[PDB]
Amino acid sequence: GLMQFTLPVRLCKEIELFHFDIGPFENMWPGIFVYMVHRSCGTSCFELEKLCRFIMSVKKNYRRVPYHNWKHAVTVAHCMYAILQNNHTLFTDLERKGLLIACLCHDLDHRGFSNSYLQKFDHPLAALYSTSTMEQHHFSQTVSILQLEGHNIFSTLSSSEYEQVLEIIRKAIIATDLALYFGNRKQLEEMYQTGSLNLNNQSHRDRVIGLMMTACDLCSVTKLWPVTKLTANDIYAEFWAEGDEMKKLGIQPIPMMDRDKKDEVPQGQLGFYNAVAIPCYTTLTQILPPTEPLLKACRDNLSQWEKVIRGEE
Numbered sequence: 566g567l568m569q570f571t572l573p574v575r576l577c578k579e580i581e582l583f584h585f586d587i588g589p590f591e592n593m594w595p596g597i598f599v600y601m602v603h604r605s606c607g608t609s610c611f612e613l614e615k616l617c618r619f620i621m622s623v624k625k626n627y628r629r630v631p632y633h634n635w636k637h638a639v640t641v642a643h644c645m646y647a648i649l650q651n652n653h654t655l656f657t658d659l660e661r662k663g664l665l666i667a668c669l670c671h672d673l674d675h676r677g678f679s680n681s682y683l684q685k686f687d688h689p690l691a692a693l694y695s696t697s698t699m700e701q702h703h704f705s706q707t708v709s710i711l712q713l714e715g716h717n718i719f720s721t722l723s724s725s726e727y728e729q730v731l732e733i734i735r736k737a738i739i740a741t742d743l744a745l746y747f748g749n750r751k752q753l754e755e756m757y758q759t760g761s762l763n764l765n766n767q768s769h770r771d772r773v774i775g776l777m778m779t780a781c782d783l784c785s786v787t788k789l790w791p792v793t794k795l796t797a798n799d800i801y802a803e804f805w806a807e808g809d810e811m812k813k814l815g816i817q818p819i820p821m822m823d824r825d826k827k828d829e830v831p832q833g834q835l836g837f838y839n840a841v842a843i844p845c846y847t848t849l850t851q852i853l854p855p856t857e858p859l860l861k862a863c864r865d866n867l868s869q870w871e872k873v874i875r876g877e878e
């Protein structure tokens with residue numbers, strides 16, 4: 566009850582910043598997550614014994630893949646924490662509970678393959694879920710862990726509060742499907758510009774939370790250049806493995822996934838910052854002004870990729 570988590574001084578300060586890197590010590594990530602729940606939600610939100618047991622079951626159901634791993638899960642949660650802490654009064658009590666858990670859980674049991682590869686492989690999950698294949702899986706896994714004995718972190722909620730929080734988490738995890746991001750942002754663009762954006766409108770809140778999920782999920786592009794650059798190696802390590810598996814199915818993979826086309830990576834990153842990342846944080850910043858530093862960091866990293874192309878590195 567009177568038992569706070571406390572971090573070292575440098576982490577205690579840096580963790581409040583959008584560009585915070587959680588570092589290479591795995592054993593500290595659970596404590597960092599709990600610290601973030603306690604300041605974001607309150608020390609009263611979750612039964613510490615049940616939280617801890619849930620965190621460790623979640624960790625266990627992430628795989629030893631280069632990018633879509635336990636470190637990605639905690640990174641995406643930290644970004645969401647920073648968004649919640651910089652927009653104190655905009656989110657309900659259930660949203661604060663739901664979204665950090667959504668972020669921790671959003672890539673549960675990821676194998677490092679896209680929805681496309683599952684469909685071309687004809688993986689069982691592609692017959693079970695026709696669209697947002699892995700993301701329906703990740704939600705499924707979240708519900709399973711929630712139903713392990715002693716793992717129900719939501720048990721002190723009413724029956725309908727419980728149902729609202731699982732619906733927040735479901736929508737939040739589905740929206741991490743980048744295929745759904747493009748239309749979500751165009752809608753949020755029109756609504757904000759024409760003036761019709763209404764945060765009392767639940768359909769509107771869903772959309773804004775979706776955009777936050779995309780922003781948190783992509784947040785490798787909002788770190789200091791060296792974190793961004795080394796994270797991109799893990800991202801391509803998965804992409805090029807998938808490319809190899811595509812070749813093993815007698816399908817020529819897209820250049821993104823073809824390790825023979827490494828030289829085109831810098832130009833590929835540009836396309837991605839211009840088509841996905843910059844517009845995501847642009848629209849996010851218009852809806853939530855205090856998230857501007859994510860936009861600023863993204864633009865800094867675009868400029869760094871431009872320098873890679875000009876042989877300046």
Ligand SMILES: Cn1ncc(C(=O)N2CCC2)c1C(=O)Nc1ccn2nc(-c3ccccc3)nc2c1
Pocket residue numbers: 743782783785786797800820821822826827829830831832833834836837
């Ligand atoms: C940085 N970051 N963060 C999340 C994701 C991402 O998309 N996902 C999905 C799972 C996490 C990425 C990323 O780098 N995306 C991209 C997107 C498009 N292209 N196109 C190339 C390319 C084209 C030709 C030749 C060479 C490379 N490279 C990329 C990389």
Ligand SMILES: [Mg+2]
Pocket residue numbers: 671672699741
């Ligand atoms: Mg995912």
Ligand SMILES: [Zn+2]
Pocket residue numbers: 637641671672741782
């Ligand atoms: Zn993710």
